[PDB]
Amino acid sequence: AALVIDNGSGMCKAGFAGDDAPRAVFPSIVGRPRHQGIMVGMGQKDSYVGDEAQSKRGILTLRYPIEHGIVTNWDDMEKIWHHTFYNELRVAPEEHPVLLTEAPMNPKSNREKMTQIMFETFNVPAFYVSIQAVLSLYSSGRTTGIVLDSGDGVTHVVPIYAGFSLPHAILRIDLAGRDLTDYLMKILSERGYSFSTTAEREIVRDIKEKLCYVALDFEQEMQTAAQSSSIEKSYELPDGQVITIGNERFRAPEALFHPSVLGLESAGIDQTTYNSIMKCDVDVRKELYGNIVMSGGTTMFPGIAERMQKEITALAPSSMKVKIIAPPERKYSVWIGGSILASLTTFQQMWISKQEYDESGPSIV
Amino acid sequence: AALVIDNGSGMCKAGFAGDDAPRAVFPSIVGRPRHQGIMVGMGQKDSYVGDEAQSKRGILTLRYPIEHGIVTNWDDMEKIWHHTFYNELRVAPEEHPVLLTEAPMNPKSNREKMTQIMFETFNVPAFYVSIQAVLSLYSSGRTTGIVLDSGDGNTHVVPIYAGFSLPHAILRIDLAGRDLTDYLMKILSERGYSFSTTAEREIVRDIKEKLCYVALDFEQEMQTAAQSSSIEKSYELPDGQVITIGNERFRAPEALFHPSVLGLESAGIDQTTYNSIMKCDVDVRKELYGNIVMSGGTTMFPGIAERMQKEITALAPSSMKVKIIAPPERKYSVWIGGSILASLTTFQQMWISKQEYDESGPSIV
Amino acid sequence: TALVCDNGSGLVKAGFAGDDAPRAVFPSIVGRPRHQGVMVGMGQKDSYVGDEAQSKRGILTLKYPIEGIITNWDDMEKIWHHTFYNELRVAPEEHPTLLTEAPLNPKANREKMTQIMFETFNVPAMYVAIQAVLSLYASGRTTGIVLDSGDGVTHNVPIYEGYALPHAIMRLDLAGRDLTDYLMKILTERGYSFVTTAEREIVRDIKEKLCYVALDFENEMATAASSSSLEKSYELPDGQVITIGNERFRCPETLFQPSFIGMESAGIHETTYNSIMKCDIDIRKDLYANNVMSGGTTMYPGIADRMQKEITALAPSTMKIKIIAPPERKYSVWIGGSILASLSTFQQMWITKQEYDEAGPSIV
């Protein structure tokens, strides 16, 4: 059996080939103690990965190697994996084939470097790197799909025609679940809240994930909150103190369609779907309009699939089969893309072998 | 039973002998990959043909290997026949007498090329190649008749007498079904459309194929377009936006009679129909006048039979029997004519046999 | 003095007669507000215009009024209503204005161009002028086929006796926008970000700065894949020094083999042979010898050496190939206007305010 580790800008996702749910779902953080000690409590282990590092904000300095799918730092990424093998998945890398994810439009040098580390500091028998949305497309039951990922870091739209991604339309807004929380932290503080700590960033993250939704129309909904507390939803903080969130609740996800609310003056995910599809050829486009597949955690907000269905019905040809297929499991579909792909008896011949690596080297990827 | 395959320069038509209507009708395109993959979707078949290729021209390269009824690229042609057997008609060539076409006055090197590729690759027990226009006349029910075979690529006028195409009179105009469309694509962008992809041009093609017609007088019609919305025809695009096509509808048909609109200083089809009768002997001419047969997909324009009937009686004085027969099946008469010709109990002795091929070589024609 | 304005979808350039270099230059773009949005310092403006529309895009969405050819008039009017006012600080009422059109500019839109100029503007005299004729004029040539290429436009125009043969003009829609989106595939496939409209604004520039054609396709395909020469570093306007390489040839080679996107059009060398092959026989002599290029997308280093070879391969070898490349070229249609507006014989050629009154839009 093989291994699959989705290296997410917020949450990394490890496991084996064949399983349905990701075996090690964890924050992609490496944490290093600011002054390293002799003992327990004091800050003893040279780097901490996942939720331990995160609890231990008192002792550590927290670092995320992967920003917008682009792995920026390889010393933190590697040291994650030393822990993904020996501490998370509780395996020995040299025994199991590995599939790791990479962004839609991810660096060749970053690919070629990941290629290096895996067969080398980890000696894994076999490896393959795979483009995030294309793997969501595999978990969507397709060969053809305009797939739109929004993870914690990156938000990429891809026209998959017959398994081939068409790069000449692969689009993006650098706006995702992390930028989304920061918006809600602002607009609660502007409601009058003091939310400032990273702990209260997790408060503002939780509120985002549970109470934030995408209005079917933005302006209408605003005055709907103005006229009714319908929208207003209570929240029990770790204080026990109940707060109330109101028109914030739909303003926060609406970054994704109206990005410019953060000051991030891009076109919205609606617009970028359309603009990906036009940059394709016309028969591709037909099935892209019918095979708009959503992916990521930030694709989860209430109303988003219906809203995308609304907007793209107007933006696409009136007589077209517009069809969103929003995955229920979409915070993980990229790992479910990996695990199926690794388990594919066909795909067994598509792995990078240890042989081709030692005869040809990292440049074959 | 035998087979018949009218290799149209845009639409090829195939089937068994003695069927009334064509069993395999498809575009003549073979597509190769840009770079083939190995798996599902990604380029697994070295050569996708006809309708299949069309859907997949994203990942492929297409070429339409047949110009003015004459095959330019015999690689693609061999592959097209290989298609119609195994994929379309779902048969094995070696079981089959085959009849294929060649355009009026098609060259014998080209003929002989085809003549071979049957009996050495496809090893068919019998074969024949037939002159499109004479086959139309057969399917008309005449010995004698001046045929205008006007289709996607070629427009050819042929005076048949007693079952003989008079080769010296076969007159030719080089604008036809595609030259017509691409003119209409400009004249649609002159009104204000932005049809520029191949499938934005499939729109243009199907507009010509649905709303267009040949005016009886070009002036009265131009003026009537500029007044009353009877000439105006609305069209539901594969956009669903209904648009309206007006004075374009006939001014693109008027290219065939005044090729000068393209800048093609060639005599109108009417004039050529007249002139071809004038390029034959005096006595037989009145029969050619009484039996002008239109074949081809392009003479399936509305108004066109009526119009040629107007113009040849006005390009004569008045009294003489001019007569256009443009059959309701004229896109396919060449096929139905091969069907009959192959089914002829008499004409069984006129097949090119697999035996006489191997004894006497492809030049026997 | 007169006023002169080269309207492109990329850049609109203005100024006066007599000056050698364009007085105004701006992107052709306005923004109309997705919310009521006080840019604290101005009042509630209708439209932020050009390098203003994109400055504040978050409030107000970018459109291009004229994709070489005029579509939308509410944006369009704000562009003529930028250039006089903010850009030149001049009043329309005062100044005989000349405006351009990309070659093959149609009946209906020019009628309304002429209308608006005399009404909401009141200009004392206006003249629209066909971009490629003005290029050849600014060149100092009587005759010769011209090739405009731009962000939205490309054009082959046979000029004789100061006159374009209209019928023989080809526009190529595959222009510099297509090219910048293509570069924007490829760097992204190497792994850079480059795909928001902000990063279009970057990837336009990088191309303009570093992207060349090279004389042979096969040999340059060899160098690209094998040698560390292709790479050039570049700070984009955040700070990330990237490395562009290969694409520098693998983008503008689309003007020569448009198939690179899957658009199948004949390459410029083909279109130019065929545009001259929309003209006669021996009369073709110094069309082949006075072949002028124009616009934005003609800046690419390598194209001329390439094109001369590729046009000569197509053609009966005795034709004297002489293709001219000025260094000012984004402005050649402005400098075809200004000096030709200053030229005295032209006072009679303008469309006056008076003649408009009697003739209506129908004088354009």
Beta bridge partners of B205: none
Pairing between β-strand C291-295 and β-strand C323-324 as defined by DSSP bridges: parallel
**Which residues of chain A have a CB within 8 Å of the CB of C32?**
none
Residues 6+ apart with CB under 8 A from B52: none
Token digits for A77?
């990424």
HSE-up of residue C179 (Cα within 13 Å, Cβ side):
35
Q: Are strands B155-161 and B145-150 parallel, antiparallel or unpaired?
A: antiparallel
Residue in B59, B197, B236 nearest the CB of A161: B59
Count the helices and strands in chain B (H runs, E runs): 13, 19
Strand B97-102 and strand B126-131: the pairing is: parallel
Q: If DSSP codes are grouped into helix, strand and coil, which group holds residue B356?
A: helix
Q: Within a 10 A sphere around the Cβ of A36, how many other Cβ atoms?
A: 12
Residue numbers in B near C262 (CB within 8 A): 58
User: Helix crossing, C268-276 with C303-313: angle to 10°?
Assistant: 50
Chain C positions in Cβ-Cβ contact with residue B263 (cut-off 8 Å): 167, 278
Indicate left, alpha or beta for C246 from its phi (over 0: left) and psi (-120 to 50: alpha). left
Is the CB of residue C89 less than 8 Å from the CB of residue C82? no
Q: Do B200 and A162 touch (CB under 8 A)?
A: no
* Alpha-carbon gap, residue C33 to C45, rounded angstroms: 9
Joined together, the tokens standing for residue B326 give: 């443009």
8 Å CB contact of B238 and A166? no
Contact C264 B58 (CB under 8 A): no
Q: Which two tokens stand for residue A264?
A: 């991030």
- The nearest CA of chain B is from the CA of A317 a distance in Å of 4
CB B137 within 8 A of CB B145: yes
Measured CB to CB, residues of chain A less than 8 Å from chain B are 143-144, 161-164, 166, 280-284, 286, 317-320, 346, 349-350
Mutation for testing the B interface, residue in A319, A340, A344 having most B CBs under 10 Å: A319
Sign of CA dihedral C357, C358, C360, C364: negative
Are the C-beta atoms of C133 and C164 separated by less than 8 Å? yes
Resolution of the structure in the document, Å? 9.5
Minimal-distance CA residue of chain C relative to A257: C58
The coordinates were experimentally obtained by cryo-EM
Determine the Cα–Cα distance for residues A270 and B111; give it in Å rounded to an integer: 55
Chain C, nearest residue to A110 by Cα: C191
Packing angle of the helix pair C176-190, C197-210 (nearest 10 deg): 100
* R_g of chain A, CA atoms, integer Å: 21
Which chain B residues touch C173 with a CB distance below 8 Å? 196
Q: List residues in chain C touching A: CB distance below 8 A.
A: 34, 56-59, 181-182, 185-186, 188-193, 195-198, 261-262
How close C92 gets to chain A, by Cα (Å)?
Answer: 34
How distant, in Å, are the alpha carbons of A288, A331, C302, C330 from that of C69? 30, 46, 29, 18
Judge whether C324 and C291 are in contact, CB under 8 Å: yes
C188 contacts A168? CB cut-off 8 A: no
Interface A:C, Cβ pairs < 8 A: 57
**Pairwise CB contact (< 8 Å): C181 & A173:** no
What is the phi/psi pair of residue B33, to 5°?
A: -75, 160
β-strand partners of A234: A244
Burial (Cβ within 10 Å: 0-12, 13-18, ≥19) of residue A213: buried
- Please, are residues B134 and B165 in contact by the beta-carbon 8 Å criterion? yes
Contact B263 C106 (CB under 8 A): no
Minimal Cβ distance to A284: which of B54, B58, B237: B58
Whether residues A144 and B41 touch (CB distance < 8 A) is answered with: yes
- Please report, in angstroms and rounded to a whole number, the separation of the first and last CA atoms in chain B: 23
Cβ-Cβ contacts under 8 Å for A306 (sequence gap 6 or more): A216
Please tell me which residue of chain C has the smallest CA distance to B260. Answer: C167
Residue B172's φ and ψ, nearest 5 degrees, are -140, 135
Rounded distance between C-alpha atoms, residue A84 and residue A67, angstroms: 19
Beta-carbon neighbour count of residue B89 at 10 Å?
18
Minimum-distance CB partner of B240 among A163, A319, A349: A319
Euclidean distance between CA atoms B165 and B159, whole angstroms: 6
Hey, are the CB atoms on C193 and A171 less than 8 Å from each other?
A: no
